[PDB]
Amino acid sequence: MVVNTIYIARHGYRSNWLPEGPYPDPLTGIDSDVPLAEHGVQQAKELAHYLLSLDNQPEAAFASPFYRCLETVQPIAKLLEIPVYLERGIGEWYRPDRKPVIPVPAGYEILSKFFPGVISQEWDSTLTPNEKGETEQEMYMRFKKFWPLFIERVEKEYPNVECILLVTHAASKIALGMSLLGYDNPRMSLNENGDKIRSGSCSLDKYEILKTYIPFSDRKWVLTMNGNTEFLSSGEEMNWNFDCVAEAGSEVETVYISVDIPSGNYKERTEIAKSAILQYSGLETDAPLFRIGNRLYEGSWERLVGTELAFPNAAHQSEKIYRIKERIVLSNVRPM
Amino acid sequence: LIADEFTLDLPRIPSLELPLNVSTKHSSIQKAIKMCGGIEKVKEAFKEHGPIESQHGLQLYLNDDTDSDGSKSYFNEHPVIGKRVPFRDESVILKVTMPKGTLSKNNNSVKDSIKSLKDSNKLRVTPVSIVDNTIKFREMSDFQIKLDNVPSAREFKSSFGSLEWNNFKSFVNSVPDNDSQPQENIGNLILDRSVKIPSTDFQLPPPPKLSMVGFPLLYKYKANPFDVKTASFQDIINKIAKLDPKTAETMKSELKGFVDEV
Amino acid sequence: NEAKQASIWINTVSELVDIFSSVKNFFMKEERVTLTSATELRGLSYEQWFELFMELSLVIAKYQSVEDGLSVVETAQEVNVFFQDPERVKMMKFVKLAIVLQMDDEEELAENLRGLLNQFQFNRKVLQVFMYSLCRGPSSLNILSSTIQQKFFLRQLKAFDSCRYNTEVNGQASITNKEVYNPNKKSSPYLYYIYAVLLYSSRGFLSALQYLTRLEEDIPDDPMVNLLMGLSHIHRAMQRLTAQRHFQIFHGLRYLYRYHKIRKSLYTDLEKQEADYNLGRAFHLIGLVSIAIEYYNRVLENYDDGKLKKHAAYNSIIIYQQSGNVELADHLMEKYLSI
Amino acid sequence: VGEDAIQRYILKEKDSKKATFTDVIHDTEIYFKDGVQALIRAVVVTKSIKNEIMWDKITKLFPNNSLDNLKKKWTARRVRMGHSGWRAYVDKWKKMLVLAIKSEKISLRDVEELDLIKLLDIWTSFDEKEIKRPLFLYKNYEENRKKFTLVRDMSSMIQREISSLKKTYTRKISASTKDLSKSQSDDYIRTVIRSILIESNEIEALKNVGNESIDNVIMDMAKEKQIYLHGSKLECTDTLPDILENRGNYKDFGVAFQYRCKVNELLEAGNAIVINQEPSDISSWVLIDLISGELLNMDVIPMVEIRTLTPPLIIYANSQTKLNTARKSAVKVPLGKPFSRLWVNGSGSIRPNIWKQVVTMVVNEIIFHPGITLSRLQSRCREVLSLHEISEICKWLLERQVLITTDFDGYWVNHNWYSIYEST
C-alpha cells in the first residue's frame, strides 16, 4: 500500500465575512468565488509552517479548484515545495434550489494566470458535482463514490506518494471524513458524547491506518487528529456542521500539562518514535493509564518546583508561550 | 468503546524551566523573559551546540528593575547561569479545555478540574507538542557584592548607566588629564560624604566571576588523597610584634600559653 | 510623556544636525561650502555644536538605538574642529565607550578600553571605569582572561615601577604620564589589584596570592582584598597537586572571617547582609552544605532588604532540592522568588 | 480642560491597569542478520551470568564479522530500547532462567561452562508458550482495571553537572493506594529477620504476623542478594555487615569527642593552639565547627618561596564565652520486644555496637543533606533500616540536640554533632 496518511483542510477566511465592506467582487467572475481576507492571507501561511514542522509532510496536494481553495494552498505549495493538482470531486456543496445559480469552478488555463507554476495540469477530475446542485443524499453518495476511485488513481498516476493533502469546504471536509470512516450518513456523531468532525477556518484533520496490496474498501481508517487549529493566532473561527441550516460562510479556559517519560539512566534520552499514537484513560483519577506506541504506562499527578515556559513558535509580534506547571510522570507498566 | 488514538506527529518545541514562581498574567510571563535578556536571547540560547564546559548558556538576573534615571536598580548582579539539558527525555504537552471559571472553583488545580468534570463532554484533552530541548538553571549564584554605598560606583552608575548628559559632562570634566597620586585612595578625589565608608576601603571594584566553579567542590572533610615547635613563648610573641605590636601586646596581656596541635 | 519627549527633542536636534552635517569642508573622505567661519558656524559656537553632537548621541542610545548612537559619535570623530581640540577628543572617547557598553560587541569594548588606558596612563578614575565596564557576564570575563590583557597590564605595572624607583625595567610601557608624585615609593594599589584580578580570573591562583599579599602590606583593612585572598586559598587548596589541603582551607576561612568582621562592623545593614551571604556561599563552595544554610537563613530572617534574599533563597532551594525536601523549596520559591 | 481629558486618562488606566489583566488560560498570545534477537539474547545471557559481554564466545554462536558488525549492531540496537527495554529483557531472562532451573530444564554445569546454544534454546523453548497483539485502552477507566490487572514497575565535575541538569524536582499531589499498613508490616518483617541474622528456643516479635508473609520476605531478600542458606541455616550476605561497618564510623566519632574536650579545656584556660601541619581528617571536623561558630579568634605568625603564603596559624577563645555544651540528660535508647529492632537482641538487650553504628550512619547522611526528610532518608538506608527504626533514631537524636527540625519536617545537624559517645 502507498497512501497511508490523508490530511483534509478547510479554506481560509472569506472576504464576505468581514463586519464592513467594501466587499470585493469575485476576481474569477464566478458567483460566490470570493477572495481570502487578510486573516486568510496570514492563516494559510501559518498552516504552511505547521505542516512543514511535522515529521510526516504531504507529497502531493489536491485542491478543490475554487479560487479560495487554490489561494489557500498557494503558500503551502511554495513553503513545503510540493506539486498541486486540481480535483473537482472534493468540490463545494450547493443545495438544488440555490438562487440565483449553482456556481461552476474555473479551469487550469485561466487559473494559471492567477497561480503561475503553482498549479499543474497532469490530473483530470475523478468525478464532478451535478450542475443543477445536489440534495444532501446525492451529495453524500458523491463523496462515497469518490474515495475508492481517487486513491486507485493517485497510487497509479504517482508510484510512491504516501501522504496527501486535500484543501476544501466545510460540507466537503465533513462528508469526506465521515465517508472515509464509513458512516451511513454524515449527520451522525462519532461517539455517544456527541463529537463531530469540526470545520472552522483553516481547520485540519489526519486519517491513518491502524496498527502487497489490500483493497481500499477493506482497510479501516482512524481519525487521529480532528480539527487541529492550535497554529492560528486568532484560533478556530466560523465553525460549521451539517446541523446548520444555512450553507457555510454566508469562554474556553485552556490549561497545559506535561506528560514525562523518565528513562532509568542519566547518559541517555527517552525518544518517542515517529509514527506513534497516544491513548489514555482516567485523567480524573490519581493513576491515569497512558499508551505511547507499544508500551503501556501508569502516571502520578505532580506540581513542578518552579515554572516551565514552552515556546511553540520556536519549533524545529506575539509568541504563544505556554505555562506548564502540573505534570503526569509516567512509570512503565507490565500487562497482567 | 476504545479511547481516542491521538497523533504524536506533532511539532517539536523548546522549553525553559525557571527557578521562579511565575503567575498567569502577561505582566509576569513578560517580566520573566526580560530577566533572561528578552525573547531574542532565549530563542538564540536554544540554538547553541558543543561541549557543555564551553557553552555560554543563558544568563538570569534575579534583580533587574530600573531606577528613575533609567540605570539598572542593581548594577553588579552576577547572573545565575542556565545551560541546555544534555539529554532531555521527551515529554508531550496536553491541552485541557475547560468551561470558563472551572479552574478557580478547583483551587487552581488541573487534577481537580478534571475530576470535577468526570462525566462531562465539554472537557476536551488533546496532545499539542513534544519537547526535546530545555534550558535549566541549576548552578549556584555567585558571590554578590553590594555597591549601593561605594562613592565611585555611584558616580559610574549615575553617568555611564544613566546616560544623563549633565552627569556625563560633570564626570569627564572631573577625570584628571594626568594623575599625580595613582598610589593614593580614590576617596581623596571623590569628596561625597552622604555615604558611610571607612578610609581603609580603597573602593576596589569587584571581579566579574568570584566562584570559578558553578557546583560545590568535593571537600567532604577528607585530606587530599593525591620550626616554631622549638620556640619559647617570648620568641613567638616577638615574631608577631615584628609586623604589628598591637596584636602582640594584646596577646601577651591575655593568653597563658601556646600549644602545638601535635 | 518621557519617551515621546525624547522623540520630540531628538526631532528638534536632528534638524540642527542636518544643517551642520551639510558642510562638507569638514567631513573629509554639501561641498566645500564654508570658508572663513572663525568661531560660530550657522549661528552657534563650535562648542555648542560639540555639545549638541554628544547630547544627541546619548539620547539616541538611551531612547531609540545603540548603533544609531555610534553613528552620531562617529560623525563627531570625523569633524576637524572636534578632532583638533584636546578637550573634545577626551570627551569624545568616553561618550563612544558609554554607547559601546549597551551592545554585546566584546572586541569593540576591548579596543575602546585599550585606547583609554594607553592615553590616561596610571589614572585612578580610568582604571575604575575599566573594571566597572567589566562587572558582568562571560563577555567581560573573556576580556580579563585573555593573554593580551595580562601582557598589557604587566607593561603598565613595570612602567609604574620605573617611575617609582628611577630605573629601566625590561619591556616597560613608555612613561606618558610623567606627572606622578610618589615620594614614599608606594605601589599603585589599583595596578596591583587589577593585575591580581587578571591572574585570578584566568585560574592562576598561586600568582594571584603573590600580588594580593603585596596589597595586604599597604591596605590590610580592605573588604575586597581580604575576600579575594580567602577565595584564592580555597580554590588553590582544591587543585589535584596541593598537599596541605586542610591547612589551606583554614587559611581561606581566616581571610573570609576577616572580611566578615570588616563588613559587619564598619558599614550599614546592606553590607552586613552581604557579609552573611558571601560567607555562607564560601562554605557552599567548599562542600560544607550544613553550615551554608545557617548563613543563608540569617540573610533571610535578620534583615529587611530583599535584593540579596533572592540569592539566599535560590541557593537554599538548590540545597533543599538535593536533600529531597521539595516542600521547603516550594515554600521558599513562593515567598522570595515570586512574580 | 474639559471632562474628556479626565475620562481619556481614566480609560487609558482602565485599559492598562485593571485587576483582571490579560491572563494565559485564555489570551494565550504574548506580545513583547535475522538472528538479531539471538544476538540481543546472547548479550543478555553473557552479561547476566558472567557480569560482562563475552564477545569472544558470542562470535562462536551466530556467524558474523570478528567483533565489528556484532558490536556495532548491538550498540545501535540498545539505543532504540533504552534502559527500560534492557530491564524488560533482563527481567524476562531472570524469570525464564529461575523457572528453567526450578524444573531442571538445564544442568547447572552447562551454565558454568556457558553453553550458549542450550541457554538460548531455554528462552527459545519458553517463548513458544504465549502470543499477544500490541495493547489498547478502553475509554472507561474502570473497564481497563477489570480487563487488566496491570503491574507497576561521587564523580567528576562535568558528570555531576550533566546529572544535575537532567533531574526534575516535583511535589507529588496524588498516586495509587498508599497501602501503608501492609508496607509497614512487610518492612517490620524485614527488621525482625535482619535483627535475627546480624549476630546470634522461641521468637516473640513474629508471633502476631501472618505465616504466609514470611515466605515472601525471605524470598525477596534472596532475590536482593541479602541472604544465603545452608540446608537449615540462613545467613546474612556481607552487604548488611559491610554497610554498617563502612557508614557507621563510631570509632572516629570517639576520637572527635576526645579532641573537642581537649580543645575546650585549653581554650577556656586561655591557651592558644598553633597549627603548622595538616590536621588529620578527624581534627578537621572539630576545628571547622569551632571556627564556623565565631567562638575562635585567629591570628598568624608571620615569616621572612611558595611556603611564605602558608604560615603557621594561631587559634584562641574570644573571651569568657563557654565552649562546652550543657550536661547530658538521660535520653533513653528506644527499645522493645526481643529482636523487634536491629539493635535489640533475643535477650531483650541493647547491642551497643549496632546502636553506635546505626546512630553514626544516620547522622552521616543528614550532615551533607541539610533538610532531609524521613521518606528520602529511608530510601538511602533501605538495605538496613525500616521507616519506623529511622523514626526512633531521629527522635533520640532530636532529644540529644544533635539535630534540629527544619520547617516542613526535615532534619538539620546542629553544632557539636560528633559528640555522640565516648570511645577510642
Side-chain angles (χ1 to χ4, degrees), chain B residues 202-216:
Chain B
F202 265 59
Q203 312 193 26
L204 297 177
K209 200 169 185 179
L210 284 172
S211 184
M212 298 298 278
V213 189
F215 287 85

Short mmCIF file of all heavy atoms in Angstrom, two decimals, chain B residues 202-216:
data_model
loop_
_atom_site.label_atom_id
_atom_site.label_comp_id
_atom_site.label_asym_id
_atom_site.label_seq_id
_atom_site.Cartn_x
_atom_site.Cartn_y
_atom_site.Cartn_z
N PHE B 202 39.64 51.14 49.74
CA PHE B 202 40.17 51.77 48.54
C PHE B 202 39.17 51.84 47.38
O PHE B 202 39.53 52.23 46.27
CB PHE B 202 41.50 51.10 48.18
CG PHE B 202 42.69 51.86 48.73
CD1 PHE B 202 42.80 52.09 50.11
CD2 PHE B 202 43.63 52.43 47.85
CE1 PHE B 202 43.85 52.88 50.62
CE2 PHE B 202 44.68 53.21 48.36
CZ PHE B 202 44.79 53.43 49.74
N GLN B 203 37.91 51.48 47.62
CA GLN B 203 36.83 51.42 46.64
C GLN B 203 37.15 50.49 45.48
O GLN B 203 36.77 50.75 44.34
CB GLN B 203 36.36 52.81 46.19
CG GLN B 203 36.13 53.72 47.38
CD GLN B 203 35.38 54.98 47.03
OE1 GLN B 203 34.61 55.04 46.09
NE2 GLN B 203 35.55 56.03 47.78
N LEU B 204 37.92 49.44 45.74
CA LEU B 204 38.31 48.49 44.73
C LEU B 204 37.06 47.83 44.13
O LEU B 204 36.29 47.22 44.88
CB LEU B 204 39.29 47.47 45.32
CG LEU B 204 40.61 48.07 45.82
CD1 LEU B 204 41.46 46.96 46.44
CD2 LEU B 204 41.44 48.72 44.72
N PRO B 205 36.83 47.93 42.82
CA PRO B 205 35.66 47.35 42.20
C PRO B 205 35.76 45.82 42.15
O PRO B 205 36.86 45.32 41.99
CB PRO B 205 35.61 48.00 40.82
CG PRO B 205 37.08 48.22 40.49
CD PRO B 205 37.65 48.61 41.84
N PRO B 206 34.65 45.06 42.23
CA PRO B 206 34.64 43.60 42.28
C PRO B 206 34.79 42.86 40.94
O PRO B 206 34.30 43.34 39.93
CB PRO B 206 33.29 43.26 42.90
CG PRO B 206 32.39 44.40 42.46
CD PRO B 206 33.33 45.59 42.52
N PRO B 207 35.43 41.68 40.89
CA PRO B 207 35.62 40.91 39.65
C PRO B 207 34.33 40.34 39.05
O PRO B 207 33.41 40.02 39.81
CB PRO B 207 36.55 39.74 40.02
CG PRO B 207 37.25 40.24 41.27
CD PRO B 207 36.17 41.05 41.96
N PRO B 208 34.27 40.06 37.73
CA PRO B 208 33.07 39.52 37.10
C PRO B 208 32.74 38.06 37.39
O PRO B 208 31.67 37.59 37.02
CB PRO B 208 33.26 39.72 35.61
CG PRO B 208 34.76 39.77 35.44
CD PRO B 208 35.24 40.42 36.73
N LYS B 209 33.64 37.32 38.02
CA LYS B 209 33.41 35.93 38.43
C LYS B 209 34.30 35.63 39.61
O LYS B 209 35.52 35.66 39.48
CB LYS B 209 33.65 35.00 37.23
CG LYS B 209 32.96 33.65 37.46
CD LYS B 209 32.96 32.80 36.19
CE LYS B 209 32.16 31.52 36.40
NZ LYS B 209 32.12 30.70 35.16
N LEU B 210 33.72 35.38 40.79
CA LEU B 210 34.46 35.06 42.01
C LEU B 210 34.52 33.56 42.22
O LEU B 210 35.60 33.03 42.47
CB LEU B 210 33.84 35.80 43.19
CG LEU B 210 34.18 37.29 43.25
CD1 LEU B 210 33.38 37.99 44.34
CD2 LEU B 210 35.65 37.50 43.58
N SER B 211 33.40 32.85 42.12
CA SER B 211 33.35 31.40 42.22
C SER B 211 33.73 30.79 40.88
O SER B 211 32.90 30.71 39.98
CB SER B 211 31.95 30.95 42.62
OG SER B 211 31.92 29.54 42.80
N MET B 212 34.95 30.31 40.72
CA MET B 212 35.43 29.74 39.45
C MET B 212 34.84 28.37 39.12
O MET B 212 35.24 27.72 38.16
CB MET B 212 36.97 29.73 39.43
CG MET B 212 37.55 31.13 39.53
SD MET B 212 37.10 32.17 38.14
CE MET B 212 38.30 31.62 36.91
N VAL B 213 33.90 27.90 39.93
CA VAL B 213 33.20 26.63 39.79
C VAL B 213 31.72 26.88 40.06
O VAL B 213 31.39 27.57 41.02
CB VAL B 213 33.79 25.59 40.75
CG1 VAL B 213 33.22 24.22 40.45
CG2 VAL B 213 35.31 25.47 40.65
N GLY B 214 30.82 26.33 39.26
CA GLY B 214 29.37 26.53 39.45
C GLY B 214 28.72 25.55 40.42
O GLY B 214 27.62 25.79 40.91
N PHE B 215 29.40 24.46 40.73
CA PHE B 215 28.97 23.40 41.61
C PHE B 215 29.90 23.29 42.82
O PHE B 215 31.07 23.66 42.73
CB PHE B 215 28.89 22.10 40.81
CG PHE B 215 27.72 22.07 39.86
CD1 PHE B 215 27.83 22.65 38.58
CD2 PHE B 215 26.52 21.49 40.26
CE1 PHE B 215 26.72 22.65 37.72
CE2 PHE B 215 25.42 21.47 39.39
CZ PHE B 215 25.52 22.05 38.12
N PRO B 216 29.42 22.85 43.99
CA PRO B 216 30.25 22.70 45.15
C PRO B 216 31.35 21.68 44.90
O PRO B 216 31.13 20.67 44.23
CB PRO B 216 29.31 22.27 46.26
CG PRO B 216 28.18 21.56 45.54
CD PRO B 216 28.07 22.39 44.27
#
